[PDB]
Amino acid sequence: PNRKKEQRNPRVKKRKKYEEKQKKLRSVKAVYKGGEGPGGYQGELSGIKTNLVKSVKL
Amino acid sequence: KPQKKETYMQKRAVVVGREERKLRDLMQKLTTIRKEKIAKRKAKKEAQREKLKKELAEIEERRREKQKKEKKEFWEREGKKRK
Amino acid sequence: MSSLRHAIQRRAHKERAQPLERQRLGILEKKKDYRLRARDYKKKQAVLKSLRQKAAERNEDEFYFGMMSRKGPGSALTRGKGFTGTVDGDRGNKALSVETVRLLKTQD
Amino acid sequence: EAARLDSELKLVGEYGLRNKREVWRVLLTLSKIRRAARILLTLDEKDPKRLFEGNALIRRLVRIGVLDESRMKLDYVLALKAEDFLERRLQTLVYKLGLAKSIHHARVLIRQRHIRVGKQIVNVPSFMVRLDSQKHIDFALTSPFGGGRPGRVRRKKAK
Amino acid sequence: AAWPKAEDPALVQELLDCVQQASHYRQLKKGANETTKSVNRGTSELVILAADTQPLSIVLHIPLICEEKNVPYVYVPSKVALGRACGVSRAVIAVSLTSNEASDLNSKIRALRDKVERLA
Amino acid sequence: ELSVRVPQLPGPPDTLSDWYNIPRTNLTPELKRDLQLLRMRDVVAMGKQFFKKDNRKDFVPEYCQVGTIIAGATDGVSGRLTRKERKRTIVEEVLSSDSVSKYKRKYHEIQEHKKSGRKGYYKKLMAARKR
Amino acid sequence: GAKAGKKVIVEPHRHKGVFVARGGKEDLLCTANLVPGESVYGEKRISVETPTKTEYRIWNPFRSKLAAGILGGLETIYMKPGSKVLYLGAASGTSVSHVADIVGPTGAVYAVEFSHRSGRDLINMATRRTNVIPIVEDARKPMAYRMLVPMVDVIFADVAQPDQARIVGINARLFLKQGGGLLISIKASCIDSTAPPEQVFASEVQKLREDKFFPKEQLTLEPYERDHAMVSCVYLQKEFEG
Amino acid sequence: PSSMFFEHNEALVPPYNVLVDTNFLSRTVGAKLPLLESAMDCLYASVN
């Protein structure tokens, strides 16, 4: 059965799967990613839902 | 049934303005793309949900297999003791 | 299994198009399109059948309050050329009484 | 052991290694070191064996700069780990010293033999570095970054 | 005025040493305007301020912003020697260093800011 | 010092006491339009942004005020709208911006794919038949 | 940027007093400022012609960790408009002004700061805003401003000190109502700067539970200022107010 | 939980905190083993 570049180098395949998983991580939790913008603050650039609590209740 | 007469309301309606018309056209096309995008995403979400429930029933079948093996192990190891 | 199958083994097939001596009479209903036409015809005919049960098991002396506040279908007998047995309603507008009409006229 | 899976993957991805062979190998090294650390704690404090052997091992580790010059005790000798051994792994130094834009580009550079440490060019990216040497890492003279010939692509483009 | 001054006994020397480390390691902003921009971007990990300066008011306003951001600062006694430590060919009165979260340089900086926090 | 008083005896609240007097929102059509825009703000940023899925069955809050972004003292060179750029309604602003071309193109596309084969196609088949 | 001049809409958020203003391609957070029309620090602001006296202020997260918390969606931030709040770590007063605009006139916030000239900015704002009380002293010795602080309900803390837990603990011992509340914020790099941050947070919360606190919320202000946290606890009861 | 990754805890680095449960404590006395020593050896790091 025929295969791909991505399979044929087992150096590359753990690069992309590491990239996409890190992209996959960028769905669930929140990464830091630098400070506010160097031009400045520009709002919460993708919305605010009010009624959502994300606090671990101890 | 749709009207073939022409009411005083429809005649007394005002012709709308030009800025208003541009605005309303924008609003129309906005709602269209909104509805179709919600349709695509709802469809994909439904297909992945059906996929996942298939794997849940598969793990249910495996649960029943281990249930069968375990209960038969219990009662075979139990029958000779009562024997 | 699912690695006991060769590549050209899973190479599956490709539909056969409508012949081009014919195409002015419509696309070729292969299997899936037949299934679609079926299921539509099926749910429609079962709706039709259930309605037929209702219309053979009406009772003539029902009584509601809608019948005090809608028109009735009736028949061709009293309705005319223009009769399906729909029960109409309003379209939305009523007899709009005179004083407000004067107000409208002044504004216009 | 999905935790084993994801943990090993994050090791490689943060330092773009090649396989869980190399990662497990460095882990084996760490295991031998922490075995030494366990033993030298098993001998009680102020014992002479403990004093000299632990002083030795701590000098070893700070000589390769993995355990910090700040903290010099057997507690931290236990507390070291694979991220630190990877920190003193070599290719990481090219990336953190600003010659190769990416860890993979650094891997390719080490392949085609453009960096050296001291004198000799290096081909193995898992050549462990030393604290005393780690700043003496630059391009060789034969590489077009360091000079020498402009390279084969410049050669052909001039052709 | 410059009451969180760094004392002599080689504490300033470990400071200048880590400055040399970060200046090679590109984790460094140099000059007071760069310091203000780094601390007002919040990337700053620590900032060192000279006290040997033609009037001190510059390295008095900079502590106002680092007090406004709750990130540490420390007074070296020598603008010339700090500039030489950075490798500028010019005296510098204010040098700041940021964070890069995969090293042991960060452990060094943690030690240094622990030192200055015990100084304060 | 003491006089005769006045007797003055002749629903849901109107200005919320615990949010510093936010009045009940008047239902005006341009306000409705702005509300629809801010709900459907996803498709507005076509391709480049995504938004938190704010999803209630209604969308009209009971209390809202239309306002103005005043001024940037630290920055007003380009974070300031030009005089032509200033708009009355948010909908007219997002109108007067660019990319409404790409909007219209997507519109013709979706319109065609919902006019795939539903009735016009059947009529033209019927013409190919009856001919 | 949501540039200067864009017509926007503002609505209440969940919390009593704070507001959220949505618009166009970018929403944000605001507060009705008590002191009218005037900016503090080049913060952007918002005017609405009410059917003059109606002005709001945009609240940068990255400048103010309370705002980071309001974006992180806290359980209950304990500060109703009209409440007594001891602030702690009141450096240069920006966030403090925001809390002031929350509590309004019928509230009062006690702004304590350690250094001087950040104090100067703070007391300038204390002249202007008629509900925030300037206190410039050593936080470690709260008997100094024992003359000033009455019993209050809500404790803000944002200092970065090793003895922070004991600081806010004795301040809880002195200035917090029965069934009190507090928000504090914590940096791993200033509590102990080699360890993993979650472990540092557990150490600090266990400390407060030894200070007889009831831990009742935690979050990590994750996309905004790395490895910090906001922690919410209640003073000496399981419920908040009474 | 922050400091976590795709079912891996980046958090727990040495030293390790270990909770004793009751069956475990009964059974490790019943097997006559030194608590701190055996844990330190099996983990190869410092605990409490």
Would you call C45 helix, strand, or coil by DSSP? helix
For residue E102, list chain D residues with Cβ-Cβ distance below 8 A.
14, 83, 87, 96
Please give the single-letter amino acid code of residue G29: L
- Find out whether G6 and G23 touch, Cβ atoms under 8 Å: yes
Contact in structure between G8 and A49 (CB atoms under 8 Å): no
Distance of CA D135 to the CA centre of its chain: 13
Query: How many whole angstroms separate alpha carbon B66 and alpha carbon B72?
Result: 10
The answer for G239, left when phi > 0, alpha when psi is -120 to 50, beta otherwise, is: beta
Residue F70 tokens, joined: 């005043």
Q: What angle do CA D53, D54, D58 make, to 5 degrees?
A: 120
End-to-end Cα spacing for chain F? 102
CB of E11 closer than 8 Å to CB of E79: no
Task: Give me the phi and psi of E110, to 5 degrees please.
Answer: -60, -45
Element (H, E) at G31: strand G28-32
Displacement of CA F93 from its chain's centroid (Å) = 11
Residue of G2, G73, G216 with shortest CB distance to A53: G73
Tokens representing E10 are 């080689």
Interface size between E and G, measured as CB pairs under 8 A? 36
Torsion of CA B5, B7, B12, B17, to 10 degrees: -60
The CA angle D7-D10-D11, to the nearest 5 degrees, is 90
Resolution of the entry in angstroms: 4.4
Structure tokens at G181: 């509340």
8 Å CB contact between F81 and B3: no
All residues at 6 or more sequence positions from F33 whose CB lies less than 8 Å from its CB, including other chains: B23, B27, F89, F91
Neighbours of G147 (CB within 10 A): 7
Three-class SS state of E45: strand
Q: Which of F95, F101, F113 to substitute to test the interface with B, most B CBs within 10 Å?
A: F95
Written as six digits, the tokens of C40 are 């539509």
Contacts of C24 in chain F (CB under 8 A): 128-129
Structure tokens at C54: 């209702």
- The order of strands in the sheet holding G108-113 is G132-136, G108-113, G84-88, G154-157, G180-187, G228-235, G213-219
* Count of CA atoms in the C-beta half-sphere (13 A) of D147: 1
Spatial CA neighbour of D7 closest among H8, G161, F59, C22: H8
Residues C4-10: contacts with CB within 8 Å, 24+ apart? C6/A1, C7/A1, C7/A2
- Token pair recorded at residue G141: 């010795």
Tokens of B52: 């996942």
Query: From the CA of A40, how many Å to the nearest CA of chain G?
Result: 8
- β-bridge pairing G7-12 and G19-22: antiparallel
Choose among G1, G71, G223: nearest Cβ to A31: G223
Is A18 in contact with D12 (Cβ distance < 8 A)? yes
Q: At what angle do helices D2-14 and D20-42 cross, to 10 degrees?
A: 100
Whether residue G188 contacts residue E106, with contact meaning beta carbons closer than 8 Å, is answered with no
Beta bridge partners of residue F69, listed in sequence order: G46
Residues of E with CB under 8 A from a CB of G: 42, 60, 63-64, 67-68, 70, 101, 107, 110, 113-114, 117
- Cα(G158)–Cα(G174) distance, integer angstroms: 18
Look at the block and give the residue holding tokens 């093996």: B69
Q: Would you give the end-to-end CA distance of chain A in angstroms?
A: 53
Per the DSSP assignment, residues forming a β-bridge with G10 are F65, G21
Nearest to F64 by CA among C81, D77, G46, C87: G46
Helix residue ranges, H only, chain D: 2-14, 20-42, 48-63, 74-79, 82-87, 90-96, 103-111, 152-158
Residue F87's alpha-carbon distances to B16, G156, G186, in angstroms, are 20, 41, 44
User: Token pair for residue D79?
Assistant: 């507390």
User: What whole-number distance in Å separates Cα of residue D143 and Cα of residue D139?
Assistant: 7
The experimental technique behind this entry is cryo-EM
Which of E29, E36, E41 to substitute to test the interface with A, most A CBs within 10 Å?
Answer: E41
Contact B12 C108 (CB under 8 A): yes
Whole-angstrom CA distances from C30 to C41, F123, F128, H31 are: 17, 22, 21, 74
Q: Measure the CA–CA gap between G2 and F93, rounded to whole angstroms.
A: 12
Structure tokens at B83: 């024997």
Mark yes or no for CB contact A57/G75 under 8 Å.
Answer: yes
Name all chains with 3 or more CB-CB pairs below 8 Å to chain H.
A, D, G
Please give the Cα distance from G200 to G189 (Å, whole number). Answer: 10
**Cβ(H45)–Cβ(D40) below 8 Å:** no
H or E segment to which residue F107 belongs = helix F100-114
The answer to whether the CB of D107 falls within 8 A of the CB of D16 is yes
CA distance H10 to E57: 45
- Rounded to whole angstroms, what are the CA distances from C23 to C18, C37, C97, D152, F129? 6, 20, 61, 61, 10
**Residue F54 sits at the chain A interface (C-beta within 8 Å):** yes
C-beta atoms of H4 and A29 within 8 A: yes
Terminal CA-to-CA distance of chain D, rounded, Å? 57
Backbone breaks in chain G after residues (C–N over 2.5 Å): 51
* Cβ separation H6–A21 shorter than 8 A: yes
CB contact residues (below 8 A), chain G span 137-176, against chain H: none
Within 13 Å and on the Cβ side, how many CA atoms surround F53?
Answer: 4
Sheet containing strand D137-139, strands side by side: D120-121, D115-117, D137-139
CA distance B26 to B38: 18
- Distance (Å) of CA G180 to CA D9, G151, G206: 46, 10, 18
DSSP label at A56? B
CA angle G179/G181/G183 to nearest 5° reads 165
DSSP codes joined into one string, G213-239: EEEEEEE--TTTSTTEEEEEEEESSSS
Please choose, from the candidates E98, E101, E77, the residue with its C-alpha nearest in 3D space to the C-alpha of residue E18.
E98
CA distance G127 to D158: 74
* Closest listed residue to residue D9, CA positions, set D1, H41, E54: D1
Q: What is the longest distance spanned by two Cα atoms in chain B?
A: 99
Q: What is the token pair recorded at C10?
A: 């899973």
Report the C-alpha gap between F126 and C24 in whole angstroms.
Answer: 9
Radius of gyration of chain F (CA): 25
Contact A40 F49 (CB under 8 A): no
- Tell me the CA distances in angstroms from F51 to A49, D67, F44, F54, G6, one per residue in order: 10, 46, 10, 8, 19
What the block records as the tokens of G90 is 């009141």
To the nearest whole Å, the CA of H41 is away from the closest chain D CA by: 7
Instruction: Give the single-character DSSP code of C67.
Output: G
Q: What are phi and psi of E55, to 5 degrees?
A: -35, 135
Which residue shows structure tokens 């303005």? B17
Three-state secondary structure of F48-106: CCCCCCCCCCCCCCCCCEEEEECCCCCCCCCCECCCCCCCCCHHHHHHHCCCHHHHHHH
- Chains A–C, number of C-beta pairs less than 8 Å apart: 4
Q: Do D99 and D145 meet the contact criterion of CB atoms below 8 Å apart? A: yes
Sign of CA dihedral D149, D150, D151, D153: negative
Question: Which residues of chain H are within 8 Å of residue G198 when distances are taken between CB atoms?
Answer: 1-3, 11
Cβ-contact G62, A35 below 8 angstroms: yes
Torsion, Cα of E10, E12, E18, E19 (10° steps): -150
Asked if G146 and G170 touch (Cβ cutoff 8 Å), the reply is: no
Cβ contact, residue pair E42, A38, below 8 Å:
no
CA-nearest of C93, F101, E101, A41 to G57 is A41
Nearest CA in chain A to H6: A25
Burial class (CB in 10 A: 0-12, 13-18, 19+), G179: middle
DSSP string across G31-58: EE-SS-S--SSS--EEE-------EEEE
Residue identified by tokens 């926090």 is E117
**Of residues E25, E102, E107, nearest to D68 (C-beta):** E107
Q: Which of B3, B8, B12 is facing C91, going by the closest CB pair? A: B3
Q: Read off the DSSP letter of residue F19.
A: G
Q: From CA E11, how far away is CA E19, in angstroms rounded?
A: 12
CB contact G220 to H (< 8 Å): yes
Q: Which residues of A touch C6 (CB under 8 A)?
A: 1
Torsion of CA G211, G69, E44, A30, to 10 degrees: 110
Residue in the block written with tokens 């960060």: E106
HSE toward the beta carbon, residue H42, CA cutoff 13 A: 9
Task: Map tokens 């200067």 to a residue.
Answer: G4
Chains E and C touch (3+ CB pairs under 8 A): no
Tell me which chain C residues have a C-beta less than 8 angstroms from the C-beta of B9: 93
G234 DSSP β-pair partners: G181, G214
* Gap between the Cα atoms of G20 and F74, Å rounded: 23
Chain E contact present for A44, CB below 8 A: no
Alpha carbon of C81: minimum distance to chain B alpha carbons (Å): 14
Rg of chain B over CA atoms, in angstroms?
Answer: 33
Answer whether B touches E (≥3 Cβ pairs < 8 Å): no
| Alpha-carbon span G1 to A42, nearest angstrom | 5
CA distance F23 to G51: 9
In E51-93, the DSSP E strands lie at: 73-76
Closest CA to D60 of D130, D126, D135, D152: D130
Give B-chain residues touching F109 at CB under 8 angstroms. Answer: none
H helix or E strand, kind and range, residue C52: helix C31-56
- Phi, psi at residue D9, to the nearest 5°? -60, -40
How close is the nearest chain F Cα to the Cα of B37, in Å? 8
What is d(CA D46, CA D55) in angstroms, rounded to the nearest whole number?
Answer: 12
Residue D16: list chain A partners with CB under 8 A: 11, 15, 18
CB F63, CB F22: distance < 8 Å: yes
- Between positions 36 and 95 of C, the ones with CB within 8 A of B are 86, 88, 91, 93
* Token duo for residue G35: 């002191």
Burial classification of residue E109, based on how many CB atoms lie within 10 Å of its CB (0-12 exposed, 13-18 middle, 19 or more buried): buried
